[PDB]
């Protein structure tokens, strides 16, 4: 009876998650009405995006084994007075992640309290390197374990950066080897032409990354919902917990 007694709870949570994603789709459809003020739509979509991003991340991690997307945030995202929005549910401070994460290859969306950016992270015994994609459409400034920023010809957008960062993370997964190469370059700090090579590669990476937000969001939601239908009980419990936490 407990195979059933537990199947009821799972079905319940599953229906919660499904109903939520469907509700989000509804809101998005209403916000894209001919009547709607687009600025108002952006403002409204802030909360929608914050709420659905964890679920999108879970789903997309399932659909693309190896993506290993993790939501991360920085110090300013923990300042209640300054941050525009609280970090999404399940978000971890980047420090804690660097210290605790199982070694390997990750994609990330990093929230700094204002904007979210895509990133590729590699944790070795050698150390950890973080490659941050930075939509700019600070010369010779480095930050920190090793971090490198790749300037890309993409409009920096407060309202679009979550979905855009998700998309870019997917593309980084698609260009896994290029980013691995840059990780090795970033690790090989010793080489005399490092500074050049790095910079060179930076440019190149940028290009490969740039080679609508609304449509992408819709598609991601559909994929997420259809995944939630067939999703296993652990995943269901997880997503449900994230959803509950977001409120």
One domain, residues 78 and 156: yes
Triad 17, 20, 22: Cα angle to 5°? 110
Q: Domain check: are 115 and 199 in the same one? A: yes
Secondary structure class of 226 (helix, strand, coil): helix
Does residue 78 sit in the same domain as residue 153? yes
Tell which residue, 220, 229, 214, 227, has the closest CA to residue 29: 214
Contact 168, 132 (CB under 8 A): no
Distance CA(118)–CA(157), nearest Å, equals 13
65's tokens? 């084994």
> What range does the domain containing 231 cover?
1-65+213-247
Q: Which residues, other chains included, contact 68 with Cβ-Cβ below 8 Å and sequence gap of 6+?
A: 61, 104, 105, 106, 107
The enclosing H or E element of 74 equals: none
Residues 88 and 197 in one domain: yes
Strand ranges (E), the chain? 69-73, 92-93, 104-111, 116-123, 128-135, 146-152
- 185 and 114, same domain (yes or no): yes
Same domain? 116 vs 15: no
- Do 183 and 235 touch, CB atoms closer than 8 A? no
- Torsion sign (Cα): 173, 174, 176, 182: negative
Tokens of 5: 């007694």
Q: CA 42 from chain center: how many Å?
A: 19
203 and 104 housed in the same domain: yes
Give the residue from 200, 146, 147 showing the smallest Cα distance to 178.
200
Q: Are residues 106 and 177 in the same domain?
A: yes
* 219 shares a domain with 176: no
Resolution of the experimentally solved model in angstroms: 2.4
Degrees to nearest 5, angle at CA 105 with 109 and 151: 50
Max CA separation in the chain (angstroms) = 68
The helix or strand, by DSSP H or E, that contains position 219, with its residue range, turns out to be helix 213-230
In contact, 104 and 123? CB cutoff 8 Å:
yes
Number of domains making up the chain: 2
Tokens of 160: 């679009």
CB 134 within 8 A of CB 152: yes
Do 20 and 60 sit in the same domain of this protein?
yes
**Measured CA angle at 40 (ends 15, 26), to 5 deg:** 25
**Phi, psi angle pair for 135, to nearest 5°:** -60, 120
Between CA 47 and CA 65 the distance in angstroms is 28
Q: Are residues 137 and 97 in the same domain?
A: yes
Do residue 175 and residue 94 come from a single domain?
yes
Burial 164-185 (b: 16+ CB within 10 A, else e): bbbbbbbbbbebeebbeebbeb
Tokens representing residue 242 in the block: 């994230």
Experimental method: X-ray
Please give the backbone phi and psi of residue 221, each rounded to the nearest 5 degrees, phi first. -65, -50
């Amino acid at each position: 009876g407990r195979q059933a007694g537990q199947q009821a709870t799972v079905g319940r949570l599953r229906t919660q998650v499904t109903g939520f994603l469907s509700g989000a789709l509804g809101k998005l459809q209403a916000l894209s009405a001919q009547n709607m003020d687009p600025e108002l739509a952006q403002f409204r979509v802030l909360d929608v995006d914050r709420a659905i991003m964890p679920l999108l991340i879970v789903a997309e991690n399932a659909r693309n084994p190896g993506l290993n997307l993790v939501p991360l945030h920085m110090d300013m995202a923990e300042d209640e007075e300054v941050r525009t929005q609280p970090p999404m549910a399940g978000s971890r401070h980047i420090a804690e992640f660097v210290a605790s994460a199982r070694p390997g290859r990750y994609r990330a969306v990093i929230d700094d309290g204002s904007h979210t950016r895509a990133a590729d992270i590699r944790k070795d015994a050698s150390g950890t390197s973080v490659i941050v994609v930075d939509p700019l459409r600070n010369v010779n400034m480095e930050f920190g374990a090793k971090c490198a920023f790749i300037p890309v010809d993409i409009q920096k957008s407060f309202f679009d950066c979550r979905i855009l960062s998700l998309s870019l993370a997917l593309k980084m997964h698609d260009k896994d080897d290029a980013f691995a190469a840059f990780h090795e370059t970033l690790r090989n700090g010793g080489d005399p032409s490092h500074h050049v090579s790095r910079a060179q590669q930076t440019e190149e990476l940028g290009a490969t990354l740039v080679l609508s937000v609304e449509q992408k969001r819709i598609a991601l939601l559909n994929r997420a919902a259809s995944y939630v239908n067939s999703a296993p009980p652990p995943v269901v419990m997880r997503m449900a917990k994230l959803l509950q936490d977001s409120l």
